Design a protein around this ligand. Structure first.
Ligand SMILES: CN1CCN(CCOc2cc(OC3CCOCC3)c3c(Nc4c(Cl)ccc5c4OCO5)ncnc3c2)CC1
Length: 445
C-alpha cells in the first residue's frame, strides 16, 4: 500500500478524493505525475497526484520527514506564528551526505522565537544518534523518544511542523491545452495594456488565476511553442503554469497566489511593520527563483515587484515568465512606449535588444529599491523618456532613505555598465540569505 501525505479534493470525474493517512493501492503507475489508485478504505478508484503519497512504512510516509529541504526553508516553516515550542521536522543534512537533521522551534525570553538544529548521525554499525549517550535503530524511534523527553534538546518534540499541500503536476492527468469553457472567471485582479488577470475556477472545482491576452497581442503558434518551455520550469519560487487556451483570446492558467503582488503588499497597512530582515528574506526568495532561471539558461525579461507574488508564510514567487519576448506591439519590441518598463531595463537591452540573465540582474537591483522603499517608483524625478539617456551616462539611483549603504552597494553591483561584471543570481541568493551573520553554531554539541 501507499499512504496519503495530505488530503486531496477531487477536481474531475476520473480523479480520486482522499484524506491524509488513507491507505491507497497504486494500481497503475505506468506514468509519472498522476497515478491510478484504489482506496482500501472506500473501494473507490481514480487518478491521484503521485507526490501526495508514499510507500507505507517508508521514511517518506512519516509526517515529520521533510526529506530534501534547506535549513532556511525549514526555518521559514518552523518560525510560523502559530507553532508551539517543540514543533519539529526531520530533513536531510546539507553539510553531511547520509546524515539528517532534527530542526525544532523554541522560545527564549531574550531571543524570542528561534529554531535549533541537531545533526543526526549514523553509527556505521548503523545506529542513529544526536548525542553518543542515546542511540536508535531508526529515525522513527528517535522521534518517538524525544517526543516523550527533551533530554539534551531545547524542548520535547510536541508538534509536527505544518506545511502547505504540494503543487500537483498540472490540474489533472493530461490536462494542458484546455477548453475555454472549463473556466469560470469570478474576480478581476488586474488590467494592463495587453490583457487582464482574473481569479476563477477550472472544471467547477479548482481555484486558479487566469490571465487573458487581447487578440493581436501575439501569435498563438509562437505562444504555444513558448508555453512548452514555460511548462518545463518547476521551482518552489516560480509560480506554476497549469494550462493554456492557445487560440485568441489566449488564456494563461496558473497557481493562484493568496496575498497578491509584492508591490501592493509593500504599500499601506500590509507593509507598515515590514522590517529589513523580512525584506531581505523576500529578496533572497526572489533571487532563488531567478537562480533557477539562471541554472536553466533562461531569461525573465520583465522582473519587477509587480511580477512577484506573495503567498502564505511570506512566500515570494516569480510570475509572468515567458510572455515579454512574445509581445508583438511595435513600440514594445523597440523598447519604448508607455507599455514598456524602461525603469527596470538594463541599458544594453533597451538600446540593443540584448535581454540576458545579466539584464535580469539589473532589474533585480531595481527591484531591491522597490523593496527598501515600500514600493516607491524607481527614478522618482524622471519620466520614462529621460531615464535611459541618464543611465547611459552613468546615473544610478542614490542610496534610498533609511536603506543601509551595504545593500545599496549590492544594487550598484547589479547596475554595472558591463553586464558580465554584474553578480550571479547564485551569488545574490547566498549574499542575501547570509546578510545577517550570526556568530552562532549551525548545529550543537
Ligand atoms: C485586494 N486583494 C485582491 C485579491 N488578491 C489576492 C490575489 O491577488 C492576485 C493577483 C494577481 O495578479 C495581480 C498582479 C499585479 O496586478 C494586479 C493583479 C495574481 C496573479 N497574476 C498573474 C501574473 Cl502577475 C502573471 C501571469 C498570470 C497571473 O495570473 C495567472 O497568469 N497570479 C496569480 N495569483 C494572483 C493573485 C489580494 C489583494
Amino acid at each position: 500500500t501507499f499512504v496519503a501525505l495530505y488530503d486531496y479534493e477531487s477536481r474531475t470525474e476520473t480523479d480520486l478524493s482522499f484524506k491524509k493517512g488513507e491507505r491507497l493501492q497504486i494500481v497503475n503507475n505506468t506514468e509519472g505525475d498522476w497515478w491510478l489508485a484504489h482506496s482500501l478504505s472506500t473501494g473507490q478508484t481514480g487518478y491521484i497526484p503521485s507526490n501526495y503519497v508514499a510507500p507505507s512504512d517508508s521514511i517518506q510516509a512519516e509526517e515529520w520527514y521533510f526529506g530534501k529541504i534547506t535549513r532556511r526553508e525549514s526555518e521559514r516553516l518552523l518560525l510560523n506564528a502559530e507553532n508551539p515550542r517543540g514543533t519539529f521536522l526531520v530533513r536531510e543534512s546539507e553539510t553531511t551526505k547520509g546524515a539528517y537533521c532534527l530542526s525544532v522551534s523554541d522560545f527564549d525570553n531574550a531571543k524570542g522565537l528561534n529554531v535549533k538544529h541537531y545533526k543526526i548521525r549514523k553509527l556505521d554499525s548503523g545506529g542513529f544518534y544526536i548525542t553518543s549517550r542515546t542511540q536508535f535503530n531508526s529515525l522513527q524511534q528517535l522521534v518517538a523518544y524525544y517526543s516523550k523527553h527533551a533530554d539534551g534538546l531545547c524542548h520535547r518534540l510536541t508538534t509536527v511542523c505544518p506545511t502547505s499541500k504540494p503543487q500537483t503536476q498540472g490540474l489533472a492527468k493530461d490536462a494542458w491545452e484546455i477548453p475555454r469553457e472549463s473556466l469560470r472567471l469570478e474576480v478581476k485582479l488586474g488590467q494592463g495594456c495587453f490583457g487582464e488577470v482574473w481569479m476563477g475556477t477550472w472544471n467547477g472545482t479548482t481555484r486558479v488565476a487566469i490571465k487573458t491576452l487581447k487578440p493581436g497581442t501575439m501569435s498563438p503558434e509562437a505562444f504555444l511553442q513558448e508555453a512548452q518551455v514555460m511548462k518545463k520550469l518547476r521551482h518552489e519560487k516560480l509560480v506554476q503554469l497549469y494550462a493554456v487556451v492557445s487560440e485568441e483570446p489566449i488564456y494563461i492558467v496558473t497557481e493562484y497566489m493568496s496575498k497578491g503582488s509584492l508591490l501592493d503588499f509593500l504599500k499601506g497597512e500590509t507593509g507598515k511593520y515590514l522590517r529589513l530582515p523580512q525584506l531581505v528574506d523576500m529578496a533572497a526568495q526572489i533571487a532563488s527563483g531567478m537562480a533557477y532561471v539562471e541554472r536553466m539558461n533562461y531569461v525573465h525579461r520583465d522582473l519587477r515587484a509587480a511580477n512577484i507574488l506573495v503567498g502564505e508564510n511570506l512566500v515570494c514567487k516569480v510570475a509572468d515568465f515567458g510572455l515579454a519576448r512574445l509581445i508583438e506591439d511595435n513600440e514594445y519590441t523597440a523598447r519604448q512606449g508607455a507599455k514598456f518598463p524602461i525603469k527596470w531595463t538594463a541599458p544594453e537591452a533597451a538600446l540593443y535588444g540584448r535581454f540576458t540573465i545579466k539584464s535580469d540582474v539589473w532589474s533585480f537591483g531595481i527591484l531591491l529599491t522597490e523593496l527598501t522603499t515600500k514600493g516607491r517608483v524607481p527614478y522618482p524625478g524622471m519620466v520614462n523618456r529621460e531615464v535611459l539617456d541618464q543611465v547611459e551616462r552613468g546615473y544610478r539611483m542614490p542610496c534610498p532613505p533609511e536603506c543601509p549603504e551595504s545593500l545599496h552597494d549590492l544594487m550598484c553591483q547589479c547596475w554595472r555598465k558591463e553586464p558580465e561584471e554584474r553578480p550571479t543570481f547564485e551569488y545574490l541568493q547566498a549574499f542575501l540569505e547570509d546578510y545577517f551573520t550570526s556568530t552562532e553554531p549551525q548545529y550543537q554539541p
